[PDB]
Amino acid sequence: SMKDELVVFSLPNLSSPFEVQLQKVAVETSKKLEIKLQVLDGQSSSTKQASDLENAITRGAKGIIISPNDVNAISGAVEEIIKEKIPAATLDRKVESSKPVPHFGANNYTGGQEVAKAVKAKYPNGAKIILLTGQPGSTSNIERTKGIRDELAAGGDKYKIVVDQTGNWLRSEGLRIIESVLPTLKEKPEVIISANDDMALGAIEALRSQGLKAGDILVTGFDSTPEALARVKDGWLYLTADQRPSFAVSTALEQVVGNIRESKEVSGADYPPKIILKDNLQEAERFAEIS
Numbered sequence: 001s002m003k004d005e006l007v008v009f010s011l012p013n014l015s016s017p018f019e020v021q022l023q024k025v026a027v028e029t030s031k032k033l034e035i036k037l038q039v040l041d042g043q044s045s046s047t048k049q050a051s052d053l054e055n056a057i058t059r060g061a062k063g064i065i066i067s068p069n070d071v072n073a074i075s076g077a078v079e080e081i082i083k084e085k086i087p088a089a090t091l092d093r094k095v096e097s098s099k100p101v102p103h104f105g106a107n108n109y110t111g112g113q114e115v116a117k118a119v120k121a122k123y124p125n126g127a128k129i130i131l132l133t134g135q136p137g138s139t140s141n142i143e144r145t146k147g148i149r150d151e152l153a154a155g156g157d158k159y160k161i162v163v164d165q166t167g168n169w170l171r172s173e174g175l176r177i178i179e180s181v182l183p184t185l186k187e188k189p190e191v192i193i194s195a196n197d198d199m200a201l202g203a204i205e206a207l208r209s210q211g212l213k214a215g216d217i218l219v220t221g222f223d224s225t226p227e228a229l230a231r232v233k234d235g236w237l238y239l240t241a242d243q244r245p246s247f248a249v250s251t252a253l254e255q256v257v258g259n260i261r262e263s264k265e266v267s268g269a270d271y272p273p274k275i276i277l278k279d280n281l282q283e284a285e286r287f288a289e290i291s
């Protein structure tokens with residue numbers, strides 16, 4: 001006898017392709033569960049997102065799912081939500097806290113390890129690596145890159161990170177950094193490990209403009225977007241990883257709405273991302289989108 005409850009989904013931006021997909025799944029899911037949904041867009045600003053989260057309370061949200069712009073800057077706003085006793089969870093990103101709300105999404109640390117293991121297996125006697133990292137204060141970056149670094153370190157000094165730069169998750173930055181640094185290295189690196197697809201796709205454009213062919217420098221990504229899957233299929237990109245946004249979003253909304261409607265526990269969801277190479281593209285959530 002219950003429908004049209006207001007749920008807010010606070011995203012840090014709607015400019016990056018992963019965030020755009022999270023919004024898509026959320027709107028679809030909202031219709032299936034017969035809830036009202038507002039997807040708030042932080043515009044890559046912590047100040048805006050904090051304000052968005054204040055508005056979520058004023059607007060009478062019955063549940064709030066938050067993907068924080070920043071590990072620390074959003075914490076006060078999340079604390080206000082908790083004090084108001086509004087059912088809440090994080091998704092994708094997190095905030096640093098001693099009593100976190102439930103979280104929905106892939107284990108980024110494990111994902112980072114898994115990407116590193118695949119690189120090491122491709123270069124078992126070592127490699128020179130360019131590492132492109134995400135928005136520094138995003139927990140998705142922090143955890144994923146820690147996994148990558150720790151697992152490369154466990155492989156030993158034969159894995160050498162010769163460039164280590166943030167691209168803030170942006171395609172344009174992957175392009176700029178790779179076009180800028182490749183000419184300055186006395187030896188061609190073996191691998192470019194990108195913390196996401198967007199920067200890896202920009203790296204690929206850079207390599208293409210430098211006159212290189214697919215596979216001359218290995219490139220890894222993360223997010224399993226259709227464009228990235230197309231580049232895995234044609235060999236420009238060695239791997240991506242599926243952190244299963246349809247599962248994360250649908251499960252987060254189902255559990256939050258279940259708490260609203262029936263007082264069911266919000267348990268969260270933790271799982272490893274699935275590494276996607278050329279031989280297993282059909283395991284990606286969005287395989288049907290590859291023309």
Ligand SMILES: OC[C@H]1O[C@@H](O)[C@H](O)[C@@H](O)[C@@H]1O
Nearest residue numbers: 003004030031033034035036
């Ligand atoms: O007021 C109509 C609303 O009904 C809800 O059950 C739907 O989930 C919304 O998508 C819609 O806007």
Ligand SMILES: O[C@H]1[C@H](O)[C@@H](O)[C@H](O)[C@@H](O)[C@H]1O
Nearest residue numbers: 016018019092140169196223
């Ligand atoms: O904002 C970022 C960005 O969209 C990355 O591409 C994605 O891998 C991260 O999970 C997300 O937090």
